[PDB]
Structure 1
């Protein structure tokens, strides 16, 4: 397991998200579904010029999986996935500029719900999760697990869990007071409100 420091700007963003009083936490789900949709758009487009990129799975979809025993909400997609370089280096570089712009916008009167306009909507996960685990598999790279409970660091390891084929699984370990996001009625409500027109099937699993 390798441990990395977030760039200072991203650590600062995460602290703001965790510390700021902001009741409209539900927007985290829209932001993660948006990311899934973007990743799905990417594999779809790439597959038009190289159909073999779908050898790792033809189905393009999003599953939402609540688990009350584990207190997790998992968002699974079959998008393009992220490479080790994406996880450690590339996406952080991009997130640095988006974060700066978002911070400045907040000072100017924007609110946390606008985070996705700055390309860093993922971090809104920390409105509801104490720990986020991201399992991801891109063609031509290995399956990795990224993980962070904030506090300025994240880890990456090669994942020896169940093989995903291709795509990304975001496992939200929910804060004790945010279990409403495990309720079918609540998730359905949020998806209808904010993600009604996403161009891939979203299946909300129910609990046993």
Structure 2
């Protein structure tokens, strides 16, 4: 089954009318005159076009048309073509000076455009060779929506071969909310469920997605679907893998098209065990986004350990290492402090199997060496405190020492 709609149905009966770009549109259209980015942009607009249309037909409500996004390559003409069937542009929009303009030209020696607005409006050609002048003529045979043809620069002819284009689409445009055909071959779309409302995402749907974003074969031991608009637009999903970890990677999205796939320092360093996905509508800022996500995660765990102390304990043995690096490698004491509220430790208050949290040691901090309750339960330094009043805290882990020393205190407590 081959299915694409892209062919030359157009002609310019009349004759074009050259224009000038405004004084500014020039000075960026020449500083520009990394590299694969532009299709991600062009796919975006071609969707956004279609969304704006769909949203307007249901308004009144006569049955929807075909709504696709197509991409065509030409080996012998050296071209690439993207035609959505969206709401389209009118003649005025065509002349009024908005991302995709500068990326298409960053690869094109010359762009060709066939737009036509949905309002039953004529169709127009739009030519430009990246110099200050763009012709625009009424054109015959234009199909509703917007075709974009690009005769690629001499040196950027790579995007002209199909074997090179597929990865760019699979990478960035795997979640566009309308069908997307490369050469009429349907390109996959998974559902971007991180956009949805946390209540409407079933449990089975999270799993299917965890299995994708993490390349795994199990379920997620925890799930966090953080959707909030107050600080920044975020539509996020977090998953912690179930079993014990043995040898960041949250993807980074903006309005369903990928920016960065292995987002480094989107999350802290001690949170590098989270997969899932952060999405925003905001394209140095990250040093604000990383800190605010850090808080929501710490929340989620402090409040898991409130929900179900057994699942948490299983997790804190599996992943307590990162939590320690968190406090040794974090520099600002309140962040270290807020991570310690996740540490659980064995202590004199119950037999082996007592995880006390330091937070609860507020009954009255002393701590001892490792690793077994026997070398702890008879240590001349321990028993010195067993004849003494205070309750000691038993670390039983070796890197716990450096954690609890680099965490130089807790809640202004000696530690």
Match among 170, 174, 182 for residue 192 of structure 1? 170
Q: Answer yes or no: is the 8 Å Cα contact 2:124–2:142 preserved in 1.
A: no
Match among 39, 49, 56 for residue 39 of structure 1? 49
Deviation track 1:32-82 (CA, whole Å, cap 9, x = no partner) reads 11110110001100111134595xxx0111110001121110001000000
Match among 136, 151, 155 for residue 156 of structure 1? 136
Q: Describe how 1:42-121 pairs up with structure 2 within 5 A.
A: 42-51=52-61, 58-89=65-96, 92=97, 119-121=98-100
Which structure is richer in relative contact order (CA contacts within 8 A, separation 6 or more)?
A: 1
Q: Distance in 2 between matches of 1:30 and 1:5?
A: 28
Q: Answer yes or no: is the 8 Å Cα contact 2:114–2:142 preserved in 1.
A: no
Q: Distance in 1 between matches of 2:62 and 2:90?
A: 18
Q: Distance in 1 between matches of 2:63 and 2:106?
A: 35
| Paired position in structure 2 for 1:182 | 160
Change (3 A) 1:154 1:52: farther
The answer to whether the aligner puts 1:131 opposite 2:110 as a matched pair is yes
The answer to whether the aligner puts 1:141 opposite 2:121 as a matched pair is yes
| Paired position in structure 2 for 1:101 | none
TM-align CA RMSD: 1.8
Q: Answer yes or no: is the 8 Å Cα contact 1:31–1:122 preserved in 2.
A: no
Structure 1: gaps spanning 5 or more residues: 19-23, 93-118
Q: CA deviation at 1:163?
A: 3.4
TM-score, with length taken from structure 2: 0.39
Q: CA deviation at 1:154?
A: 0.5
Q: Answer yes or no: is the 8 Å Cα contact 1:35–1:122 preserved in 2.
A: no
Structure 2: gaps spanning 5 or more residues: 1-15, 185-415
Q: Answer yes or no: is the 8 Å Cα contact 1:6–1:153 preserved in 2.
A: yes
Choose between structure 1 and 2: higher helix proportion. Answer: 1
Larger Rg: 2
Q: CA deviation at 1:183?
A: 1.6
